[PDB]
Sequence to fold (485 residues):
Amino acid sequence: VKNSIIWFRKGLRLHDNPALLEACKDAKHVYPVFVLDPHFKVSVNRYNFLLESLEDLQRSFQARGSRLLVLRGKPEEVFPRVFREWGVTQLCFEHDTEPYAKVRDAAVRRLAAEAGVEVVTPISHTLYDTDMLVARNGGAAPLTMQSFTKLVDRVGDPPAPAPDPPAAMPPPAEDMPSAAPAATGVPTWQEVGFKEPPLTVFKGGETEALARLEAAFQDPKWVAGFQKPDTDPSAWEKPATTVLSPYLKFGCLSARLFHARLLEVYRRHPAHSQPPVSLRGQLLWREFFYTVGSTTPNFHRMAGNPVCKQIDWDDNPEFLAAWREARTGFPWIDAIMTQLVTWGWMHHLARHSVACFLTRGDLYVSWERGMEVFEEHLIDQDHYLNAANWMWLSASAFFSQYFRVYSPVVFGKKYDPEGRFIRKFLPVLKDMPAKYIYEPWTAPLEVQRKAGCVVGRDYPAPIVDHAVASKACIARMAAAYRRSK
Ligand SMILES: Cc1cc2nc3c(=O)[nH]c(=O)nc-3n(C[C@H](O)[C@H](O)[C@H](O)COP(=O)(O)OP(=O)(O)OC[C@H]3O[C@@H](n4cnc5c(N)ncnc54)[C@H](O)[C@@H]3O)c2cc1C
Ligand SMILES: [Cl-]
Ligand SMILES: [Cl-]
Fold:
């Protein structure tokens, strides 16, 4: 008989899950598995988001006669056991192009073959088979968004979302010891070792992802006319973009479903925005960075990375600490960095502000250091997207216009002159008059005292003078660029 495992890593969804559909086909028993390495820096925000995503999967599987098995251990150690215990003949999982995934998945494939297990690994985390895209482009990934968009337009539409799985699923076999409920339940953030609770406002799981998708498409005119660079990074009550990145990162939402819904709207709105600024463009940025990242060695590092300029970043731990701890003395910067740690998500241009500040803009700290801080706190932390955008923002790859430097004072003021965003994430400045809220060190001491926010006592003074720092950084950047002629 056919006993299959559908192994969840990303692709934490029932919809558009060809791995799942295959595992269920003609199956007597299906074991939906997630492998939790229990000795696993990572914020509780992201880890709890994953846990909530597993809980959602548990509910969906229980609604269909099955249940999610959260196995504790390393895959190489767990799968050999359950292959034989469950008499498994087929192992299915969504393909993953991350470096670790290639190593892990190769090891699992070898073990599967030893046990006579058929391995099926469809593509469904990305819009396209990214290796096919590289092959269609003559064997090398495009290195600009312009050429990437021309490639995908020549390739055509991505595959349609896979059908929904059956309303009843073949369950796991009863009395299998490795499937005992007490050993295979979804843990809470407390049980895995976290002491502080999650603070983010975005709940994980496919069910939330689909609801947020529908909310975004409630206004097709907004979807059609979406222009990413025109959106407001200070909007926090109702974020100006979809906030689907956490759900796309974990696969709670299919990118192909997202794309297909976009085309349905675009068909009815002929003036809809186009790439790169359109909502479809945003999925293409993701596809672009996955394609280049997956084919580039050491993509997440500077040294040994062929696409990354070698820059003489300062090893300045005090500057890094100040930025990381939201005490730069620039409320716009510190507010965004507070949003990072509390929500684990910020608007793209808020990420621009803090990343430019840390790297080529002001502090001249390496983008690898900023990426590590983002990697800890972002609930949408994505290996390729985080690396690519950090290289972009530091002018190390893809982007080279290092004379464009965001002001940590003026940038946010264009959107939010009252500083409502600052007042939300930095309550110490709640009473500061708007005239000074972006530059509190310029307020008269009487204003500071009346506002209950004395610079140097309640809120730090700026760690740099932007005018002086940005001029020095641009000088260093120009030098670094001449070095790599
Ligand atoms: C320094 C820095 C770090 C970043 N780190 C991450 C990260 O770890 N994970 C992540 O998903 N994005 C990352 N981004 C990209 C971007 O900031 C987020 O994808 C976006 O802010 C998420 O909001 P949204 O879902 O509302 O995006 P929308 O505008 O609604 O876009 C829809 C989707 O398109 C994709 N997308 C959008 N913008 C980009 C982009 N610039 N690059 C790649 N894909 C994009 C995401 O999957 C996103 O959910 C980073 C950007 C910068 C500058
Ligand atoms: Cl854009
Ligand atoms: Cl600016």
Observations:
- Residues 313 and 364 are 6 Å apart (CA to CA).
